[PDB]
Amino acid sequence: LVSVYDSYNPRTILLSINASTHPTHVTKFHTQDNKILATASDDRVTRLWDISNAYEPQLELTGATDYVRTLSFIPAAPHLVATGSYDGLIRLYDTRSSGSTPI
C-alpha cells in the first residue's frame, strides 16, 4: 500500500491508498494535473488514483507484460501516459480512452 502526505511534515500522514498486495515500485504524481496519482506494482498493472477517491482506482491501466518499474507523463497531452515494463515494450497508454491496451 502507498502513502502520500504533506511535505515538511512527518507527523500528518494525509493519505494511505491500499494498492494491490504486490509491492509498488514507482509512485509518480501527474505533471500538468495536480490531483491524480499514478502508481505501478509488481502486479503488472498501473493504476491512476484521483486522491478524492483513495479507495477505488479511477482507471486500472492494464496490458503490461512484466514488472512495470518506471512510468512518466508527457507535458503536451494530459491523456497520454508513458509506461515502461521490464522486458522492453515501452507502452504508451491513453487514459481518455478505455485504457486497457496501449495505442
Partner 1 sequence: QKALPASLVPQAPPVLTSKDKITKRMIVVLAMASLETHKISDKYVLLNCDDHQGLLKKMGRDISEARPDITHQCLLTLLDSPINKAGKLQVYIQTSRGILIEVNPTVRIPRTFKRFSGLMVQLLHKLSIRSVNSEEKLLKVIKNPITDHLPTKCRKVTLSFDAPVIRVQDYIEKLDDDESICVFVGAMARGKDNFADEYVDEKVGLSNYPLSASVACSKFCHGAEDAWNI
Partner 2 sequence: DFEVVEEFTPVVLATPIPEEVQQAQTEIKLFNKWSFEEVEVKDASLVDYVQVRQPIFVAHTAGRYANKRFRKAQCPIIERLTNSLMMNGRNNGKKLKAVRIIKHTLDIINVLTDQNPIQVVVDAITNTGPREDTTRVGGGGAARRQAVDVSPLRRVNQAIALLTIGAREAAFRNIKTIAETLAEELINAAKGSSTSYAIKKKDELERVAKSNR
Which position among 22, 35, 79, 96 is part of the footprint of partner 1 (CB under 8 A)? 22
Q: Is the CB of 30 or the CB of 44 nearer to partner 1? A: 44
User: Do 70 and 46 touch, CB atoms closer than 8 A?
Assistant: no
Interacting residues with partner 1 between 34 and 53 (CB under 8 A): 42-45
Select the binding partner of residue 100 from partner 1, partner 2, none (C-beta < 5 to 8 A, by kind). none
Distance, CA of 82 to CA of 80 (rounded, Å)? 7
Q: Is the CB of 52 or the CB of 98 nearer to partner 2? A: 52
18 part of the interface to partner 2, by CB under 8 A: no
Measured distance between the N- and C-terminal CA atoms of the chain, rounded to whole angstroms = 29
Q: Enter the C-alpha cell of residue 19.
A: 494498492
